[PDB]
Amino acid sequence: DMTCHGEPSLYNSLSIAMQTLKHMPGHTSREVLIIFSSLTTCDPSNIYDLIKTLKAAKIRVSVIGLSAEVRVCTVLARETGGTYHVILDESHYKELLTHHVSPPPASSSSECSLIRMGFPQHTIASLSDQDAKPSFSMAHLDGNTEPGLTLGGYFCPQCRAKYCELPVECKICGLTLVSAPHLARSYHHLFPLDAFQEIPLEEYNGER
Amino acid sequence: MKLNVDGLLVYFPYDYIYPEQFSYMRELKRTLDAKGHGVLEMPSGTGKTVSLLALIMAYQRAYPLEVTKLIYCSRTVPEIEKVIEELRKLLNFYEKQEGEKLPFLGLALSSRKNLCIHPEVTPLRFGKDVDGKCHSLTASYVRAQYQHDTSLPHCRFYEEFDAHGREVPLPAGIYNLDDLKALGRRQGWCPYFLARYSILHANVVVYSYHYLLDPKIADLVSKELARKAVVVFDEAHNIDNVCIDSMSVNLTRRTLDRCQGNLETLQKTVLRIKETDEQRLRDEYRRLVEGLREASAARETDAHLANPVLPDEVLQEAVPGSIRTAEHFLGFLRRLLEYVKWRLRVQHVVQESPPAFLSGLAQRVCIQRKPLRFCAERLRSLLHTLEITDLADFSPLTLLANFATLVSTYAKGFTIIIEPFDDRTPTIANPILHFSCMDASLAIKPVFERFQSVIITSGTLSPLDIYPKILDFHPVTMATFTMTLARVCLCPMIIGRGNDQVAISSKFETREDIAVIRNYGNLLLEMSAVVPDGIVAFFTSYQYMESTVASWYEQGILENIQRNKLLFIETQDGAETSVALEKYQEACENGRGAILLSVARGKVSEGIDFVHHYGRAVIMFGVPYVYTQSRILKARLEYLRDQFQIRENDFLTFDAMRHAAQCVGRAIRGKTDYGLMVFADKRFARGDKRGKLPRWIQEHLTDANLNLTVDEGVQVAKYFLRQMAQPFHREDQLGLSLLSLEQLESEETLKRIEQIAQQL
Amino acid sequence: LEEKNRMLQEDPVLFQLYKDLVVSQVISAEEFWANRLVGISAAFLADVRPQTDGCNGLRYNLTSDIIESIFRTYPAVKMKYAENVPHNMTEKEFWTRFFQSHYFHRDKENSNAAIIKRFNHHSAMVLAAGLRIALNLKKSDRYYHGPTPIQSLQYATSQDIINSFQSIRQEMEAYTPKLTQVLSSSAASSTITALSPGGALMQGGTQQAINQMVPNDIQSELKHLYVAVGELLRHFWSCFPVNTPFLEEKVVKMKSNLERFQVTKLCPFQEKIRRQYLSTNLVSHIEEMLQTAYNKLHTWQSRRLMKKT
Ligand code: SF4
Ligand SMILES: [Zn+2]
């Protein structure tokens, strides 16, 4: 229910994204998706310098335009390693979004580091036990509404930080608290299912 | 890539070739085997020049006698640089394939303005001033005195070339104009004179139309040209206009004033030198009586004021004694100038034939045509014998003498128009004489009759039979190469109906309609809001465009258009126009929509090319009919009708369509380049008007898109953009519009290629 | 001073946190604040209009955003404002002059040339202001037995299992459906008893309303102390891993701050429970986290000493 007015400022948005992703670790991929409705943008400074900065920072940017192809956006996507596409209809929009859901291939410059992660259980305390300590969730403290005093939950194995939501990296020690299904949730990408052989029924002399 | 074309090997520098390019090569080979002139039409951006260069190199390597030396004619300097770069790429490909450097020499030719290195002459803004200064510093008589006096002004650049550059020819290779300048600086020589001396050595010589088409400049090149050489004309669709302009003469009252002042000064100098050294006049008289062969053939370095316009037979005869004396010729020129001014004092426009004016001059000024034939030669001898350096002030004098000589020799096909008042503003007395030439074929006449063959091609050659009539020759082959596309990169649309269903037209009667102005404004606003950044709009005339812009500004629509995309409009001055074009291109490359508003006859349609993101949208506002008030246009139409049965209206329509196609044909650089073509006029729906379009363009003009509206055009543009904005692969082109190495060997592909092109 | 104080007024909790940290001598303000530490368009004249109200009202509404845009696009307006406002003429007077000047109302060959030149200059000003890896796995079986440890996959004996496999193969070979034998009243009663509330399967039940056992003021104070402890521990673990001597000193300072915070704020809060005799071990989580931090630091000290042994 917002108001759509003014013009896009791709330079400022890309600068904000670069500043946000400046401190991210190298092994983590930096990906930017841009939805460009208008064909023109206003930039307070040279955008090609920002393109060089993104290239040096190894940030991937992909753009899906709405009306037609933009040469500057095309160059930006090609140099940053991203893909540029154009909307044909709502179905094609969904197809492009689904295609961009899938992880992009890692370039040669992609790092390979041994990251350490913790996997706490759902520590639930029973009030009958003398060891039931209700405590407000750290994530729930971030909000304006009063945090819910939950008897148990998930506690960080590194610093005993209490969180009610997973998988979320621990804010205190920076440890990424995950669960085994979360890691296994992307295993299918590791072993994609190849397309099967198509043979019409009349040509297939076997089971019906 | 190696190509087998009728048993002739072609070293194609790219891994892929268009089938139309193969047909182009085959047709060029067949024309060469007949050693005859031919006309072919190829779509722009398809690398026709590359195929031409490859086949010419194959002919030169296989049969040096068939192609002794290559001649290439161009339009603008950047095109020359592009051709040089492409030929350099081809030579590098040849070297890589063979492993050895070929004994192949290529040369590009231009003026001293593009080839002078003297630091004093560099800041000069005009070539004629550059030429005068260079001649002052490099006059043959001045050179001898400078040999006896080093302190005299001089150009060491030419001196070292004369001393050293003559003996050793430049090594075989391809040199650009800046490369020529760098070589001259390294060797201390001038690239202009060195290049002209080395033209005899270069296998390929590339320059513009003016350097050879102009009879005043023809001998500057044709002297080192044999009969086995072949000349190439690229994008010569307006070559007739070039010939007419080169053979046209204009004179004003200020020209008469300058000529009279220079004549008085010259007579004073003649008297002064006669007081100082009268023997120079006697020696000049000795040269004249003994013959002009001794004077002309002894100094090639004084070719600054050469006038080879006359036939070679006329040059043999000497000047009659009635004007051999310097003072006699001074009186001759004075009387001629006074008669010219008196005849120009007429207050109304006068239409005359050259024989009639010659008869009138003979009756009044007692001057015969035979002495007037040698007017320039005597002027040349007089100017050269007086050690004159500042010949720039003699420009009106030489112009008038050459015009008088043209009257004395060239009569048929010429019209004398005397207009004392301007066409735009008759209220100001502007006495102008036009010696308009209506026979362009004569200008191309010797080229057909001297060289083995002449090559003419362009992307806008819709009527295949008008050119043989205009140039008065029979091309051996006349084939149009149809364009085959695996992806439809062009969407030509015609919109003659406005938003309010107003009939859209560009006739001068309807040009002042405010309704058409507002319809054009609405169409432009929708295009800016829809079409990508690149927008160019070609109007019919500068005045109409300015009036329309003023109306749009007053209407207030122009503000919204500027909000959508930035607005750029050219003006008369090229310098500010160049800055505007640079700003437009930078805005297009900076992601902010830029809109250009130019005229179909402005500089934009002449030598400005568009990249894919520059030629996104080209809109022509109406059929660009020339303003008919030009009596020169009227005289040309009447002469062509009376000599070739050609309808004047047909010629006007053909010229307008050719100009429109030139404005539109530059929007595509290749298969991967897609652009939008819009014609905002209902007149294009006329079959004769519609049917006079190039075949490769008119073929994709779907009949369902004929005479659409603004909304229909916008929707079709959106659909075309979305279809053509989908990513595309060069592999998809294989077998449909592009051919691989194995696809060439397929005889079915050969049959398809033969069926693609058609001869008429 | 004034800048730092305004930040506290924006976030009263931070001011409360700052009061608990620096005023109570727990931490220094220096260490406190160590932790704490537009495009241009061509429509800036076309869109901007003199606002005329219903009845004779010039609502100019001279916002700085439009004025700054004009100054960036037109340095001439900036120069005139600097050389005139407010000495030669007032700012409102200058804007009125600009509205009434022929430069704004540009609206005949001379007029067309002027319009074209002004548009070209505007475009030039706008443009100038715009300037300023293939992978192949080795051990696939790791996925077949992933994060699951080795299970007790106990295998059967010798081929006699086949005999048992035969037994069922012969037991169910001649089978007849049965209805009465499926269930019994005693079995149903036992199942209900297992499913009866408070039973073996019905573990636990209703619990105690801890919300009422903890006062809302105590709830808010616990939230604030949790925020403080979280910030302190984030600073503590931020130094980790320790690779430079500076991190050791910073961690020592952080431990001292944590100890002072426990002495100053935690204990009276603890007594606040003890005076109210709250049975909820809300402090127990905080004590556990603090002791975990202490143990981690002391263990790392031991490791560093062993490296120095
Ligand atoms: S000799 Fe060469 S460098 Fe000297 S003025 Fe002539 S063109 Fe220029
Ligand atoms: Zn943690």
CA distance B345 to B347: 6
Count H helices and E strands in chain C, helices first: 15, 2
CA separation for the pair C134, B226 (Å, rounded)? 63
Kindly state the tokens that stand for B546: 């300015």
Q: Which of B533, B612, B727 sits opposite A39 (nearest CB)?
A: B533
Residues in a beta bridge with A90:
none
Say yes or no for a CB contact (<8 Å) between A43 and C130: yes
CA-based nearest distance A52→chain C, Å? 16
The rounded distance, in Å, linking the Cα atoms of B251 and C189 is 127
CA distance linking residue B416 with residue B348, whole number of Å: 13
Chain Cα centroid distance, residue A63: 15
Residue B136 DSSP one-character state: H
CA of B81: how far to CAs of B46, B49, B107, in Å?
18, 13, 11
Q: Which of B109, B110, B112, B185 to mutate to test the pocket of ligand 1 (most atoms within 8 A of CB)?
A: B112
Judging by beta carbons within 10 Å of its beta carbon (0-12, 13-18, 19+), is residue C190 exposed, middle or buried? exposed
Within 13 A of C137's CA, how many CA atoms are on the CB side? 8
Coil, strand, or helix at residue A85?
A: strand
Is residue C14 within 8 Å of C35, Cβ to Cβ? no
Contact indicator for B526, B535 with CB cutoff of 8 Å: no
Which residue does chain B place closest to C131, by CA atoms? B590
After what residue numbers is chain C broken, C–N > 2.5 angstroms?
37, 107, 132
The domain made up of B490-733 has a fold known as Rossmann fold (3.40.50)
**Identity of residue B718:** K
Centre of ligand 2 from the C-alpha of residue B551, in Å: 70
Element (H, E) at B233: strand B230-234
Q: Nearest Cβ partner of A67 from B589, B613, B721?
A: B721
B–C interface: beta-carbon pairs under 8 A: 50
Q: Do A126 and C204 touch (CB under 8 A)?
A: yes
Nearest ligand to the CA atom of A168: 2
Distance from CA of C93 to the nearest CA of B (A): 27
**CB of A176 within 8 A of CB of A156?**
no
- Give the DSSP H or E segment for A92: helix A90-101
Q: Is residue B158 in contact with ligand 1, taking CB distance under 6 Å?
A: yes
Cα-to-centroid distance, A120 and ligand 2 (Å) = 11
Resolution (A): 5.6
Nearest Cα to Cα of residue C269 among C213, C212, C223, C209? C223
Q: What is the rounded distance in angstroms from the CA atom of residue B435 to the CA atom of residue B416?
A: 5
Q: How far apart are the first and last CA of chain A?
A: 53
* Cis peptide, bond prior to residue A167, ω within 30 of zero: yes
- Residues B220, B225, B228: CA angle, nearest 5 degrees: 160
Say which experimental method was used. cryo-EM
Nearest ligand to the CA atom of B189: 1
Q: Tell how many helices (H) and how many strands (E) occur in chain B.
A: 35, 21
> Residue A44 and residue C39: Cα distance in Å, rounded?
5
Report how far Cα B35 is from the mean position of its chain's Cα atoms. Answer: 25
Distance from CA of B667 to the nearest CA of A (A): 15
Asked if residues A30 and A60 have their Cβ atoms less than 8 Å apart, the reply is: yes
Q: What single string gives the DSSP state of each residue in B156-183?
A: HHHHHIIIIITTSPPPSSEE-HHHHHHH
Q: Which residue, B218, B215, B221, is CA-closest to B196?
A: B221
Nearest Cα to B714, choosing from B513, B461, B466, B522? Answer: B522
Strands, E, within B394-461: which ranges?
A: 414-421, 429-437, 453-457
User: Which one-letter amino acid corresponds to residue C131?
Assistant: L
* B243 in a known ligand binding site: no
Count of helices and strands (H, E) across chain A: 7, 10
| Amino acid present at B54 | A
The C-alpha atoms of residue B264 and residue B25 are separated, in whole angstroms, by 60
The answer to whether the CB of B594 falls within 8 A of the CB of B527 is no
Interface of B with A in 605-624 (CB under 8 A): 612-613
How many Cβ atoms from other residues are within 10 Å of residue C70's Cβ? 18
- The minimal CB distance from B591 to the residues A40, A84, A86 is found for A40
Q: Do A71 and B726 touch (CB under 8 A)?
A: no
* Cα–Cα–Cα angle for B2, B4, B7, rounded to 5 degrees: 140
User: Which stretches within B465-612 are classed as H helix?
Assistant: 466-471, 508-511, 514-530, 542-555, 557-564, 574-589, 604-607
- Residues 9-28 of chain A with CB under 8 A from chain B are 10
Q: Count contacts between A and B (CB, < 8 Å).
A: 54
The CA A18 to ligand 2 mean position distance, Å, reads 27
Closest CA–CA distance from residue B588 to any residue of chain A (Å)? 8
Q: Across-strand partners of B597? A: B537, B569
**How distant, in Å, are the alpha carbons of B41, B459, B638, B753, C306 from that of B46?**
11, 10, 38, 15, 77
Task: Please say whether the beta carbons of B231 and B38 come within 8 A.
Answer: no
Chain C CB contacts of B551 below 8 Å: none
Cβ–Cβ under 8 Å, residues B751 and B29: no
Q: Report whether B691 contacts B655 (CB < 8 A).
A: no
Spatial separation of the C-alpha atoms in residues A44 and B571, rounded to whole Å: 29
The span from the CA of B461 to the CA of B480, in Å, is: 8
Across the interface, of C47, C111, C127, the residue whose CB is closest to B550 is C111
H helix runs in C132-215, sequence order: 141-144, 160-171, 185-195, 210-213
The tokens for C246 are 């500076």
Residue B712: alpha-carbon gap to chain centroid: 38
**Taking a C-beta distance cutoff of 8 angstroms, is the pair B332, B323 a contact?**
yes
* Cβ within 8 Å, pair A141-C293: no
Residue with tokens 């007790």: C152
> In this structure, what token pair is assigned to residue B588?
């297009």
Confirm if B60 and B97 have CB atoms less than 8 A apart. Answer: no
What distance in Å separates the CA atoms of residue B106 and residue B88, rounded to the nearest whole number? 9
3-state DSSP percent of chain C in helix, strand and coil, to 5: 65, 0, 35
Q: Which residue of C has its CA nearest to B585?
A: C127
Tell me which DSSP letter residue A117 carries.
E
- Name the residue type at position B491: C
A138/C233 Cβ within 8 A? no
Of A155, A172, A176, A174, the C-alpha closest to A164 is A155
Spell B335-351 as b/e; 16+ CB within 10 A means b. Answer: ebbeebbebbeeeeeee
Phi–psi pair at B61, nearest 5 degrees? -70, -45
C112 → closest Cβ in B549, B559, B576: B549
Q: Binding residue per annotation — B134?
A: yes
- Ligand 1, closest atom to CA B118? 3
Distance B742 CA to ligand 2 centre (A): 64
Long-range pairs, B497-502, Cβ under 8 A, ≥24: B497/B682, B497/B707, B497/B708, B497/B709, B498/B522, B498/B523, B498/B709, B498/B710, B499/B709, B499/B710, B499/B711, B501/B709
Task: Reduce the DSSP state of residue B140 to 3 states and report it.
Answer: helix
Chain A residues in contact with C240 (beta carbon < 8 A): 173
Identify the closest residue of chain C to B554 by CA–CA distance. C107
Give chain B's end-to-end CA distance (angstroms, integer): 31
For ligand 1, pick from B111, B116, B389 the residue to mutate: most ligand atoms within 8 Å of CB. B116
Distances (CA, A) of A148 to A144, A153, A162, B662, C280: 12, 11, 12, 75, 15
Within the 625-684 window of chain B, which residues sit less than 8 Å (CB to CB) from chain C? none
Contacts of A135 in chain C (CB under 8 A): 226, 282, 285
User: Which residues contact residue B746 at a Cβ distance below 8 angstroms, ignoring those fewer than 6 apart?
Assistant: none
The reply to whether C112 touches chain B by the CB within 8 Å rule is yes
Place of tokens 């041994």: A114
Length of chain B: 760
Q: Would the CB atoms of A135 and C293 count as touching at under 8 Å?
A: no
What are the structure tokens assigned to C182, written together? 């499926």
Look up residue C147 and give its amino acid: P
Distance CA(B463)–CA(B460), nearest Å, equals 9
The residues with which B110 forms a beta bridge, in sequence order, are: none
HSE of B134, CA atoms in CB hemisphere, 13 A: 28
